[PDB]
Every structure is written in structure tokens, then in C-alpha cells.
Amino acid sequence: MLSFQYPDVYRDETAIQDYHGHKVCDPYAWLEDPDSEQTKAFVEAQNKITVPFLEQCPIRGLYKERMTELYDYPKYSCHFKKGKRYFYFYNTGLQNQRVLYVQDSLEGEARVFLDPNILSDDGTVALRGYAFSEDGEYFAYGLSASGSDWVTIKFMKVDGAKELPDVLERVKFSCMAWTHDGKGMFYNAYPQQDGKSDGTETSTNLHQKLYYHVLGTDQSEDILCAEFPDEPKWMGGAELSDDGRYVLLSIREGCDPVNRLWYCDLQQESNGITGILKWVKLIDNFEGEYDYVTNEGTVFTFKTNRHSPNYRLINIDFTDPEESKWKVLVPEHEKDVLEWVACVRSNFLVLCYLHDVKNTLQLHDLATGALLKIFPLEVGSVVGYSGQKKDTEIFYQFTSFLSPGIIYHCDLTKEELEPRVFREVTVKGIDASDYQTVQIFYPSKDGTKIPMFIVHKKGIKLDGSHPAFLYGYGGFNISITPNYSVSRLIFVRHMGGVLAVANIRGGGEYGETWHKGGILANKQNCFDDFQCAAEYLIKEGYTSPKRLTINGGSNGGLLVATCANQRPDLFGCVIAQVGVMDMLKFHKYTIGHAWTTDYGCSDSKQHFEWLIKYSPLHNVKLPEADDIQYPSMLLLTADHDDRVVPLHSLKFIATLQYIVGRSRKQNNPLLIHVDTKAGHGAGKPTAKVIEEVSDMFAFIARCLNIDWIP
Ligand SMILES: *[C@](O)(CO)[C@@H]1CCCN1C(=O)[C@@H]1CC[C@H](C(C)(C)C)N1C(=O)CCCc1ccccc1
Secondary structure, three states, rough: OOOOOOOOOOOOOOEEEEEOEEEOOOOOOOHHHHOHHHHHHHHHHHHHHHHHHHOOOOOOHHHHHHHHOOOOOOOOOOOOOEEEEEEEEOOOOOOOOEEEEEEEOOOOOOOOEEEEHHOOOOOOOEEEEEEEEEOOOEEEEEEOOOOOOEEEEEEEEEOOEEEEEEEEEOOOOOOEEOOOOOEEEEEEEEEEEEOOOOOOOOOOOOOEEEEEEEEOOOOOOEEEEEOOOOOOOOOOEEEEOOOOEEEEEEHHHHHOOOOOOOOEHHOOEEOEEEOOOOOEEOOOOOOOEEEEEEEEEEEEEEOOOOOOOOEEEEEEOEEEOOOHEEEEEEOOOOOOOOEEEEEOOOOOEEEEEEOOOOEEEEEEEEOOOOOOEEEEEOOOEEEEEEEOOOOOOOEEEEOOOOOOOOEEEEEEEOOOOOOOOOOOOOOOOOHHHHEEEEEEEEOOOOOOEEEEEEEOOOOOOOOOOOOEEEOOOOOHHHOOOOOHHHHHHHHHHHHHOEEEEEOOOOOOOOOEEEEEEHOHHHHHHHHHHHHHHHHHHOOOOOHHHHHHHEEEOHHHHHHHHHHHHHHHHOHHHHHHHHOOOOOHHHHHHOOHHHHHHHHHHOOOOOHHHOOOOOOOHHHHOOOOOOOOOOOEEEEEEEOOOOOOOHHHHHHHHHHHHHHHOOOOOOEEEEOEEEEEOOOOOOOHHHHHHHHHHHHHHHHHHHHHOOOOOO
């Protein structure tokens, strides 16, 4: 099968660094420079062997045609009301980017409000963040080019969709919050830096500042309202309280779900907003999360994890602020994770819990916390919601493994609350009734029970004959919940596959104790959990090692790359998307410093000792056994991925191809594809999504020699 040669790639054998006494060689360090002729030539040589490999077999075309056909269905957001008008996002099916629509009534004719598709030929300019003024008459929105985290904020007057001159540059990881006087908006920006700021650079992002922009002015007049020059990693995000009286500042450092909470009573400002605000440091440490829900005068309701790993709701009175005085409004549940909360219709709270990786939605009274109404849902996820304090109705969107999504509406003025199907769409071609979802709980190495979802065609023999696609992430308190994937269901229907998603430690499925179980010294639990998931599928007869594919993105790309290294005999195929591969240097680039809360940092001897043991870049080793090789491996990245700089995948594939690729016994291909005008994934246009999944399943099909089933 291996009918190509790996490119020649220079090894700088002088690149030796000391880490607390451990000499580490980094011969591909030079790939850290994206702009060098040498790096650009490496990328070209790699894509030159990958693309033909992927496009040789007729199955890529079959898959791409079936994907294009089945992905072609109406895709809606929830309606949301802003001032006098309703808005919703809608894609007719195959538009590169969804379009924002407006209508003046829920029953009236909608018209295009903002259409990103016209800002590029190829859909690579995307919306990234927006905020309407409190009255709904003005609109701010962020645009990113080529998948970069960098944003430009532009502005419109809603009536007539009129473009305004205001443009805010150097926006990244930013809040967007209008003061209720309609005068201007808070946002975040980074100081100027040498070299490029377009998504191709690797330069670290530090000293993020909080600014206020007055509408109708140039950015250079913007007011600096908060900054932390002694704490270059601190990021201060602003929001206004529901009554418009207070600015709330959530200062983060790293990805841990914790924040300082400062406030500014805007009425107490000496002459409106003219400089650094008179911040009151309500919570001035990083011990807990405080997520603003609503207030009633000085009584502020927050979702918190303080003393509550599964989260709870507390009331802090600004006039009696000590911790011992706080009221517990809705206590922590013993198992169920309180994911998010919203206040609607003045005195209702909407609460969304995660119960064994499935969502429930409940309505509660604001005054007492008492449960009032359960909104009935099938097994799956709530992935969209609208309804804020002033609103008298909610919309919410539900999805699962086997159904695209239903949007419900519920009129909260009604004595009897009966939610109703507002929009529902049928993907004809994949009959949901042909398949089943099961959830099982398997023991990991240390005996911890891990959930796993398995989706498969009804009445299959568990004889180990099926190809399988096992997905994980495992990190950053993120829960991996049921979602509708056309691309995955084709694998099932047309490649006879079994799909699995393992809810490994590191994620948020069981609150902070679950997150804490997959970070720092205990990161290895994630990899152990994920290996055990594979072994469960094998032992139980869903698949065999030779037919098993694993997949993960970002922190999940780390997960699958590490698993490739640690248990190469367990997997036939590995697809690592935009993965963190160099665990010794991740912190040096763009926003990487923020991930040390999950990973630790190599500057510390203790942390270095954890990291060296699983860092994919540092653990490529020919398997000792003669009969064991590395799985077929495909790394996917893109030249504007400034979330996870592509040097991670570049150095890793260079190492895979040298250490393992050159051995006689290695016949499984080790490839990388580096896309252009794309980044980490968010905002990727439909055309690129389709190319991507076609590439991935074609790789699987060729490596495992899977027949297409029409
Ligand atoms: C991928 O796993 C996921 O895209 C990469 C690689 C490691 C972590 N990671 C992220 O993107 C992290 C995971 C949490 C967070 C969000 C945006 C997905 C919630 N990540 C960030 O990098 C956010 C960066 C900006 C930031 C920093 C601190 C606090 C808030 C936002």
C-alpha cells in the first residue's frame, strides 16, 4: 500500500535543552517558525504525499457525495428577541456560513440582516461574537478571517441594517457588553506586537486590556477601564447587570472554572466612564467560579462551584458581602451537574442539569429556588437557549445522536406552561428507527466507572467484526454530550460502523471532581480511561483492534496521539485533529499559557516529571514486539490555527516519520494534512467541513480496506 516516500527532513542534532537535569533533544525545533522557507517547503512536501493517498480510492468521492446530499438540510438557531424584533440564524443547507435573519413579529416576514457569505468567495470570513445594545437598536459583531482567533468588531444600526463606520481592531478572547445608556460597549484588546497578528504567528498573547468604545468615535479615543500589568496572564471580561446599574468584571487566569469578581456601580462614577473604573473587589481570589445569573437591587444571584463540585446557586448581597452571609438559593445536587442558568420573565430561573451525560431542563422560582416545572426532553443535549430577564418567553434547542434538532418554544405568561415544537427538521435518508443508542459504564484501570455512549445498527452480532469509531476529549471541564453528526452516521450506515464516545475523566460530566480526576499529576487517568474504553469495545465484541479508529481534536488530539504511543497494538487507525503534541513547549505560544491549569508547566520540576511521561512528541518509540507496529495515523491541522499552533503537528509527524516511518515493519502510513485559510475549527465554512470529513473517512476506509455500502 505504501507507494510514496516520506520527505527528507533536516534534524538539528545540536538542539539540546536541559530540563531540570534531563537532556531533551528537539531536532525539529526549526518547524516552530511558520514563515521560513524550510517550514513552508516541509508543509508542501507533506501535503504532496497525503492528498493523493486520500484521493486515490473512489470511496472519498462516494463519501463526499453522500455527505453533501445528507448535510443538505435546513439548519436553524433558536429565535431570540432584541428590543422590538426577533432574530434567528438560518442556513438553507449547504451555505458556507449561517445567515442572521430579522423579523418584526414572530408571525411576520423575515429578511436577511447579516450574511457573512458575501464577505469572501470561500466562506472563510466568519462571525465570532456579537452583542446588541440593551434597546436592540444597535448591533456589534466580530469577524474572524481564515479561522483565526483574531477578531475585528464592526457595527450596524438595526433599523435598515445600516453599516456604521466604527471598527475595533486587535480584539481577541473578548467580551462584548453595551452599557444600557446606549453610549458604547466594553470589549477586550491586546497591545501591539511585532510581526504578524493574523493567525499565522506563534507570539504569546499577554496583557489583555479592557476597553470602552463610545459609538461614533475612532478606536484611538477608547477608554481604558481595567488592566493588570503586574499579572500579564489575567483576562478581565465585562458584562452589565440586568438592571444596567453595575459593570461586573470576571477576571480569569488559565482555563480553570474560577474567577475574581469585581463590580462597578456605574452611578458612582465621578463623570461617567472616563478612565480606570472604581472597581470594588467583591471576590478577589481564584478559589471559585461566580457566574452572574441576575440581581434584585444589591442581591446578586450567581452559579458557583465554591464548596460545590456539582455547582449551586447562591445569593450574595453587595451590602453584606462576607461569605458567611451568603444564601444558598438552589443547593448542590449530589450527582447532577448544574451546567448553566438563566433568569427570564423577571422572577423565573431556567436551570439546565447534566444527569449521566444527558440534559434536563427545569423552571424554578427566583425568590425561593423552588422547582416549578420540568420541560420534558428525550435523551440528548440542550445546545441553544434564549430568554433573558425582560423576556416573557423562552426558546430552547435539543439535539441527539440520531435526530438533527427540535426547537421548542414556551410562553411564560401562561398559567399552564406547555412547551411546543417551534421548528423540527427531518434528514430523510437516515432512518433513526434503524439504529439504537446505548449507554454503558465500564471500569477503568483504577476501577472508576466511566460512561460511554455506543451507537449502532439494530440487530448486529457482537462478533468483533465491525469497524468502530471511538471519540474522546478528556479535559478542561468540558462534557461531551449527544450531538447530531451526519458525517458520523454515514460511517455507520455506509461503512457499517459502530460509534462510541467515552466520557473520560478531565471532562465536566461529573463536575469538578471529574475534571480534577484528569488534570495535572493525574492526566494519565484520561489515557488510561480511553484505552479501557477501547478494550471494552473489543472484549464485548463491537470491534477488534485492527478495525478500530480513534479520533479527538485539540486536547482530544493529545489524547489520541498519546494513546497511539502508549498502546499502538490497540488501534488500527488514529485521526488527531489540531492536537497539542509538544507538552514541554505548549505554553510558549499564542494562548497556550492558559492551559497550564490542566497540564501544569515544564518550568516546574514537578510538572515536567508528569509531562515528559506522556508528551506525544517525546514518546515516539518503535514498539519492541516484532509483530506490533504503529497504527495508521493522520494529523489534521491548518496554517491559521492560532489556538493550537501547527508546529505541534509539524514536529510530531516529522518525528513519527523518522523514528517509526523508517522501520521496515512499519507499513501503516503516517501522514499530515495542513489546510490553508483555516484555523482551529470554529467558523469553518461548510465546504471545508465537507472536505475534512471526506478526508478522514477516506483515510479510515483505505487503511482498514472497508467496502462502501450504498
Ligand atoms: C483544544 O482542546 C480545544 O479547542 C485547545 C487545546 C487545549 C485547550 N484548548 C482550548 O481551546 C481551551 C479549552 C478551554 C477553552 C475554550 C475556549 C474551548 C473554552 N480553551 C482556550 O484555549 C480558551 C482561550 C482563551 C481563554 C483563556 C482563559 C479563559 C477564557 C478564555
